[PDB]
Every structure is written in structure tokens, then in C-alpha cells.
Design a protein around this ligand. Sequence first.
Ligand SMILES: O=C(N[C@@H]1[C@@H](O)[C@H](O)[C@@H](CO)O[C@H]1O)C(F)(F)F
Ligand SMILES: O=C(N[C@@H]1[C@@H](O)[C@H](O)[C@@H](CO)O[C@H]1O)C(F)(F)F
Lengths: 334, 339
Amino acid sequence: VPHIPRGPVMADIAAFRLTEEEKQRLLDPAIGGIILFRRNFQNIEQLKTLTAEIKALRTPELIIAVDHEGGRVQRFIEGFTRLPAMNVLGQIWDKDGASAAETAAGQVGRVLATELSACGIDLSFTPVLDLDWGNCAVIGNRSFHRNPEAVARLALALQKGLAKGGMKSCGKHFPGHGFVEGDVLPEDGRSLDELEAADLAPFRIMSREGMAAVMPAHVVYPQVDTKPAGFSEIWLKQILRRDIGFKGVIFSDDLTGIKERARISFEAGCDIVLVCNRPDLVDELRDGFTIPDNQDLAGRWQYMENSLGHEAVQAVMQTMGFQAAQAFVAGLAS
Amino acid sequence: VPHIPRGPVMADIAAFRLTEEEKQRLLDPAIGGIILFRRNFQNIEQLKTLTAEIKALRTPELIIAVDHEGGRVQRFIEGFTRLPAMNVLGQIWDKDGASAAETAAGQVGRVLATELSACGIDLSFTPVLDLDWGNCAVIGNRSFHRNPEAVARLALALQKGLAKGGMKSCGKHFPGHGFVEGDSHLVLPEDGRSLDELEAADLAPFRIMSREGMAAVMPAHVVYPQVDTKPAGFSEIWLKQILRRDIGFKGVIFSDDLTAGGIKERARISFEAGCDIVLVCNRPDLVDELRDGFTIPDNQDLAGRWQYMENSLGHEAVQAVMQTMGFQAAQAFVAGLAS
Ligand SMILES: O=C(N[C@@H]1[C@@H](O)[C@H](O)[C@@H](CO)O[C@H]1O)C(F)(F)F
Ligand SMILES: O=C(N[C@@H]1[C@@H](O)[C@H](O)[C@@H](CO)O[C@H]1O)C(F)(F)F
């Protein structure tokens, strides 16, 4: 079993089981992780087999992630608790108050993460920290709430729940996707002060409380930089690293030539580039790829490794407390 | 004032007032209409001035459109009634019944269209006819409902409201965007279902709206491999064989946003697939490239298809109607659904 450092590329796979070609691709030193999608899911036992064979290829084991946010963003349905959209939690906040909403968010996080942890998944790319300005359809009900305080608090409560389930968090989409219209490269014309007073606050607060990663917005904020955030040294190095003090992973979000697109991502401050639905572009990228110097990469990947062992998860899922959490969360979704 | 037929390209503009270069671009015979966005809106009076100067360039007057669906898709906010998301109408359906929901949809349509008609707008790109399968975040609350019957009936009721406000309808996104997952922004999703599955559900609102006089359709940027390997907006099977021949739709088929392989070639394959009018947004450079030496494809139905979309209310008539108590009550009712 070859020992190769996790590379800075997160790739993906076609279907339910690895092909031989995929195995060879995943052994490339450029690759450090995998993101899964609904097309990779048949049932829980198949998923376990898939994650095991991915993990068996090399050490440190490839980090495996998925988009389980809730509502209309939940890749794996059958055999999982159906998760509510995050704005459901914000509706509880408005109706029953912060305390009930936080409690509910904790349980959603716990169920979400634990069920995925049982299947060999390391991380869900959640939570969305974008504010619901009522402008952006592609975010839509994926946002907790309009109000930064509600978003921050619900996100923190979800994060604690995720940690109980073995998982770190990934805040999306830095520095805030909520204000633009999105239904192209959108433009958010606001000033940095306007963003600091609202959209950025949940990111600051989550970073302070141990958030593992961030996904950047594919959005230009011209008053701060002419470049989209995911390609901006100002956003990623000057604001996120230096000003906010964030030490976790900065993902590039989807780059899908590719070599040049990746280069500018890394140069801007991204640790890991995502290349989804395009194994051809992954093949093009990795051929003659030089791994950029990043002494923090290894630790940044490792912080995201799932913190629960397989047996410990099986035990927790047998408890009455967890099963009650499952039924509570199921009830929010219907 | 030059008399030029409306061309098959729908373009756009940069900001609040036309520049001289934009005026010259909009006189090109390749162009037949304009789509507006939030960046073109400062306030109602500026908007009126903008639409007037667009219309003054040529005859037949360039058709002007905008995306006013409701909820998180409403370009012009200040000075307009805030519109509810379409799923709010589906919630009324579930709670208070079809009759109350249809009535509400009629008022939303009326307010939506009338306020835009006051400003010189011809058409809103609405309604969404996609079904809420609980899969597609980008559609999300933009869909009326999960159930094809509810979607069809709410859409028809909205359509009658729109017509009261001077406007035709544009169904989105043919043949149905509801089932794919969509929470990236720039991927090409795949809907693996069979044609029969779509006919039993997602296609039915499109059939019904077509029969009842829907003026246009926007295609889904989605591949349905069991029917064709091409995305719907570039598929002869979807657009000619299914939409034209089988469904009998006679209105406008708009293209995807074509924004390389080159714009000329991308437009060519759109027209060849069955699109009447190509959209080229946020890229006046590509519109300039496209129109230079452009040969207008032969389409004897184009002129009538554009004209069917012209606003049916005169500007003064709309200002009068908006002073009425009945319309102001509609405004307050719709405002209340949004809050
Ligand atoms: O929102 C979506 N598509 C939008 C349309 O709704 C809109 O009328 C048109 C014009 O601006 O451009 C597309 O990008 C989709 F649901 F297809 F992703
Ligand atoms: O949804 C958006 N971006 C998504 C991320 O949320 C997601 O975690 C990632 C991995 O699948 O892929 C992006 O496209 C955006 F809002 F940025 F458009």
C-alpha cells in the first residue's frame, strides 16, 4: 500500500465502484481527495464498499467529501434520514426563538454527520453561511436566514452537531454569495465595510470557533478586487488569512487551460483545487503537474479526517438518544 | 425612424442609459430585442426613459423583456410591489385549496405585469413550470408545486393575470428542470428519465400552457440522455420533433445564454436545433462579433412570433389603471403574500 502525501487536487468518480482507470488516476500524487455525488450512490452497503476501496489505495487515506447540506442539496437519500433545508432552521428561529432553533440545528448536524461517518465519509461541505438577502436563487433556501446573527448562531450550533458526528465544517461561499443575483460571473457592488457589517461576520465567527475549511464564492466584489474571490490574493491572503486569522483549508471551488486555472488558484491562496465531472481535465492537469510548495497542506487535510472510528459510530447509532435525533430531524424534513 | 424587421438576436445593455455605441449596435438588423437586468435599473423614471429610447431607435419597436418571477428572481425592486416566490401560491393551494390559490395567482400576475407595463416592458420571463421534485436548489421555491396538475393550473391562472397587465407568458425551462440536481452554477446536469416519465409529469404543464396560448419557452440547460445526447436548447428532437410537432407549440423558442468554438457557430447550432431567437447576455463584444457579416436565417414565422409578445396596453392606459382602487388593492394583497 503506497505511502504518498495527499496532493492538492480533489477529484471525483463516475459511478458506484472504482474502475481500473480510476484507481490509477487516484494514485497520482497530485490527488489528495475525492468528492462524491448522487451518481456514486446506490445504497449504504455499496457506499461503504466504495469508500473502503478508495481509502485502500494509499496512505494517508484520500479524504472523502460530499455535499450534504439539507433539503434540495442532499446527495444520498435512501437509507439516510431526510434532512431539512437550512432555512427551516431559520424559520424555527423566527417562530420559536433562538434557543429552540439552535437545539434543532445541533441535532440536524449530529444526524447529518453521523450517518455519513458510518459510511466512511470524512466531511460534508456544509454549512452555507451566505445571508438570505432574497436575491440569489442558486443559494435560495440553502441559507439559514437573512440576519447575520441568526446565520452565525445557527451555523455554530450545526457545527457542534457535526463534530459530535465526527466531522469538521466547511463554510460556504466566502466572503458571501447571498447578495448577488444568481439564476455567469455575478458582481456584488458593495463596500468592504458593508460586507463586514453583515455577510462576513458568520465567516469570522466560525473561523474563530474552529471551522476546517471554506469554499469561495465565484463572485467579483469590485470595490475590494477586480478578481473573483477564489482567484483573489486580497480576499484569500489579506482578508481571510491575515485579517480574519483563518488557518484551515481554502478550496478553489470548481475550475471546470485547466493547468493555468489551477495555477492562478494556488497563487491566489487556495490549498486544494476541485475538479468535478471532468476526469479528462484531471488527467490533463496531473500530467507533468508540479505540486506547489505548501508546508501546511498535510496538516490542513489531516484536520478534516473523520474523528470517529467505525465501531464507535455503530455504537452511537444504537443509542436511543441518537435514534430520537433521527426521528426529530426526519420530522423537520416532513 | 428606420423600419427594420426584428432580428433573431436578443441582446442587452450595460447600465442605466444607452451609450452611442449601444444605439448603433441596437440598430443592427440582427437584433430584435433586449433583456434587462438589475444593473439597468435605478428607478422607475430612469427605466421609462431607457425603454423609450430603446423603442425610439426603430420600428417595429425592439421587444424588451425582464426576469420577474417573484421571490429571489425580481430584477427591479424599488418602486415595485415585492412579489412572492411562486411556491407561496402552491402553499395556498395545499392549505386553502385550488380556488383561493388560482385567485391569488391571478392577482400576482396582474400586479407583476401591470407595473412592468407602466415602464415600457413588453414581457416577463415567467412562469416557471418546473416541478418541485425536491432535487434542484437553483429552481427551489421558484416552482409552484411538486404536482403537475397544481403547476399547470396555477400557471394558467397566473397567465390570465399577466394578460390583464398587458403581457404574454414564457414557460421555463422546457422540458422540465425540476428533477436534476442544481446547486453548482456552471455545470450541465443530466436527467436520466425516459420520455414516458416526462410525459406523465414534467411535460404536462408545458403542453397545457402551449394549448392555452403561451407565447414563448426557455429551454433547460439539461441533457436527457434517453431522448437525446444534446442539451434541450440544442436538440432538434426536443425542439422540432417534440415541442413543435408533437406538442404543436407555435410560439417563440429562445436559446440558452450562448456566452469557445465561437459565437457564430454557437448561434448557428441553436437556430439549426429549432430556436427562433438567441440570447447573448453580458457580452456586447460577442454580440458585435456575431452581428458582423451575420446572415439572418430564413424564418417566415419570426415576425409574428415577436409581435405576439408585444405589450397589449398603451402607456397612458396603464398609468390610469394603476390609480384605480382595484389595482391598488391587488398591490397590497400581493405585497402581503411577499411578507
Ligand atoms: O434559472 C435558470 N435559468 C435562467 C432563466 O430562468 C432566465 O429566464 C434566463 C434569462 O436571464 O437565464 C437563465 O440563466 C435555471 F433554472 F435554468 F438554471
Ligand atoms: O453552490 C455553489 N457552489 C458549489 C458548492 O456549494 C459545492 O460545495 C461544490 C462542490 O460540489 O461545488 C460548487 O459549485 C455556488 F453557490 F457557489 F454556486
